[PDB]
Amino acid sequence: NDLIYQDEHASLQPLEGRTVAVIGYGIQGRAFAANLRDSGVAVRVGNIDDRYFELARAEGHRVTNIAEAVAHADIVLLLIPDEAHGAVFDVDIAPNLRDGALLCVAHGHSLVQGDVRPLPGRDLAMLAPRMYGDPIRRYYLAGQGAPAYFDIVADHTGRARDRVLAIARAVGFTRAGVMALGYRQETFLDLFQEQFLAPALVDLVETGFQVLVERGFNPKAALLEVYGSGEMGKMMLDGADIGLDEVVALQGSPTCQVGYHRWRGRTLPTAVRELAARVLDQIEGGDFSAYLKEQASNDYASLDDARRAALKRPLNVAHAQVRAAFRFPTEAAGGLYQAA
Amino acid sequence: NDLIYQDEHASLQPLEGRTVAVIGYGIQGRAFAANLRDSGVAVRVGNIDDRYFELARAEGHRVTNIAEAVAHADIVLLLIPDEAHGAVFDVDIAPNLRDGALLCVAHGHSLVQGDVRPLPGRDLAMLAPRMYGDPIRRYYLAGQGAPAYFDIVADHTGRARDRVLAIARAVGFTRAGVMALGYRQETFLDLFQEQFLAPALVDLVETGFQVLVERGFNPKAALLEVYGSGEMGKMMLDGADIGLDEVVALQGSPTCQVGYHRWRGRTLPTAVRELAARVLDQIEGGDFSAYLKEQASNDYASLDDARRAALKRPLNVAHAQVRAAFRFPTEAAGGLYQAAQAP
Ligand SMILES: NC(=O)c1ccc[n+]([C@@H]2O[C@H](COP(=O)([O-])OP(=O)(O)OC[C@H]3O[C@@H](n4cnc5c(N)ncnc54)[C@H](O)[C@@H]3O)[C@@H](O)[C@H]2O)c1
Ligand SMILES: NC(=O)c1ccc[n+]([C@@H]2O[C@H](COP(=O)([O-])OP(=O)(O)OC[C@H]3O[C@@H](n4cnc5c(N)ncnc54)[C@H](O)[C@@H]3O)[C@@H](O)[C@H]2O)c1
Ligand SMILES: [Mg+2]
Ligand SMILES: [Mg+2]
Ligand SMILES: [Mg+2]
Ligand SMILES: [Mg+2]
């Protein structure tokens, strides 16, 4: 059956007198580094010479090049982009990773592609959060956490498991649950969410917007209804708690419930299911890996073009107009990652 | 060209010495009643003899039958299901609505069907929140608000507009924005969200779950990724703030962004937009209106069956298994609708 660790199944004892090198200070790196520090764990940041290095220094961390961070650490968290794992692993990590040290990745992709490998005398694990940084940090400060998947890939020490789960406890994942799952299955699940589900959800919101605008509806009202009001986001996030069909049962007017249940299970043709299968085949069969390696070279120039093009889509032009005219509920983020 | 009111464009002055009758204490009724009370507005609840009547009493409101609430009110908010509007308006509201009093609906449907009509000497308006009750209440207490649309249908007094916007300010909608929109267009927009977009989003989440499970993926993990983790919910909520493509640009790893942009705009066949058009045709043409009255005529017996049947779906079986095994971050809701300070 499933193996799920919560607070009662993990301790910070294994991190006593140990230094964690957080490699990278991006979406994941910044949240791990902040949460580890506030949990009373000795933390160092290893980063290349870019804005994240300066940010780590600004937020009161000990910041060096990656090689120096790895050399001075008992546990190394490789929280940089997956395509950068190969070169950073071979040049900066492997040569400096001490005897009996633990290397952790937060995604199985580099393990699947063979860019990160078990090293003699050393431990290798995946601790893969099911959430991005800002929520991981906000949850942690409220005494809450996001779920994670973990895999002990190589355990020379025999202590990898408790050290990985101690990191997971210190960063807050054990407040939700840390489930045993193979790095291979994590990779395919994770890439599936990013390549089928997220695009298809945004494509559908966009489809609702475009059809309403085509048929003479107020573009601001169209944008608000399909997501801009936050209603669809609230339904999906409350749904994570009580279930999606249950949100409609509890929070829906009878008119809303009658309409919802008329089309529930009837909106999507078989082609959607088939395209999801096609995306999974591309992820598993090496097609996506080749596409990603291509896109990575020239420092993701293609991705930059795609990002700028997206902002000029009618949906995102309409978003800008709505957000200028309607105040959205936000929380102050100033010093969110400074010491607690 | 849009007319959008924020806090600077409304005041509570028009509610000075006025009593608001909140008809219903449901998803909308409870939030309006709570926020109005905390804003220092005199509120009474009119409700039929059910669990909502007792809840209103438990939460410290002056509670009576609908007719008595209306008879003692300057402003009446009709916050009960749309199919109940006709009978309640004819029997309970119209005969008891004072000269120069304002009646507000939170949805245009009863106005489009003619179940709620302008009355000589009285004001008629729509104030339609773009949000359900709990967030309306939570936002209010945080000094924030949900957006709303409004339409002045009949204005005998010539003061309908300022009184409607005063209610909107009292319940917090002006902290986000309250936009002028015809009750007809609101009806079609609102029903479209409920009949195309919400079902299709859940259908899409379910498709993701089914495909992963049918290919041997861990059912708990499949459920977490497609919504159960809260990640897709957070993306869509953060997206409402900064934009959906912008959330991916800011919070997505480069691996995630490369994957997202590979399929963005390519996932859906033309049949999806065709169905969207078909749903609007059913909404606009009277097909849905007839379907709803049929469903209501048996006290929503078919809906009760559909609700129970939905809990047996593999997605909702997996949800229960995930929720028993993983603790989810939630705020305590115990005190949510009891008296608070004005923010
Ligand atoms: N973003 C998420 O929601 C998320 C979720 C779970 C796991 N992860 C995983 O965490 C890891 C980090 O992803 P992220 O989203 O934090 O990325 P990010 O884009 O925020 O990473 C930026 C960081 O990586 C460093 N970096 C970038 N290119 C580098 C290079 N060539 N060499 C060395 N350092 C480099 C930067 O200096 C900075 O510290 C990845 O393995 C990713 O798959 C991300
Ligand atoms: N739910 C939403 O998110 C939402 C959003 C905006 C507008 N609205 C509108 O608000 C109004 C109320 O919807 P809701 O979601 O609060 O509904 P609800 O299901 O929560 O309504 C329950 C309330 O209606 C009363 N009620 C039910 N049947 C009645 C009847 N036959 N006669 C008298 N009272 C009756 C109950 O006693 C209770 O007070 C509707 O016009 C709806 O379209 C709802
Ligand atoms: Mg992920
Ligand atoms: Mg509605
Ligand atoms: Mg609505
Ligand atoms: Mg990922």
Numbering used by the authors:
A (entry chain A): 2 to 341
B (entry chain B): 2 to 344
Give sentences copied directly from the paper behind this entry.
To gain more insight into the reaction mechanism and the role and position of NAD+ in the enzyme, we performed protein crystallography. We raised crystals of holo-BurG in the absence or presence of 7 as surrogate and solved the structures at a resolution of 1.8 Å and 1.9 Å, respectively. Indeed, HR-LCMS analysis of a denatured BurG preparation revealed the presence of the nucleotide cofactor NAD+. The amino acid residues Asn48 and Asp51 exclude the negatively charged phosphate group of NADP+ from binding in the active centre of BurG. A co-crystallized glycerol molecule (used as cryoprotectant) maps the entire specificity pocket next to the catalytic centre. The positioning of NAD+ in the active site of BurG indicates that an oxidation event occurs during cyclopropanol formation. The head region (C1–C3) of all co-crystallized ligands was consistently found to be firmly locked in a conserved binding mode that is facilitated by interactions with the two Mg2+ ions of the enzyme (e for unliganded holo structure).
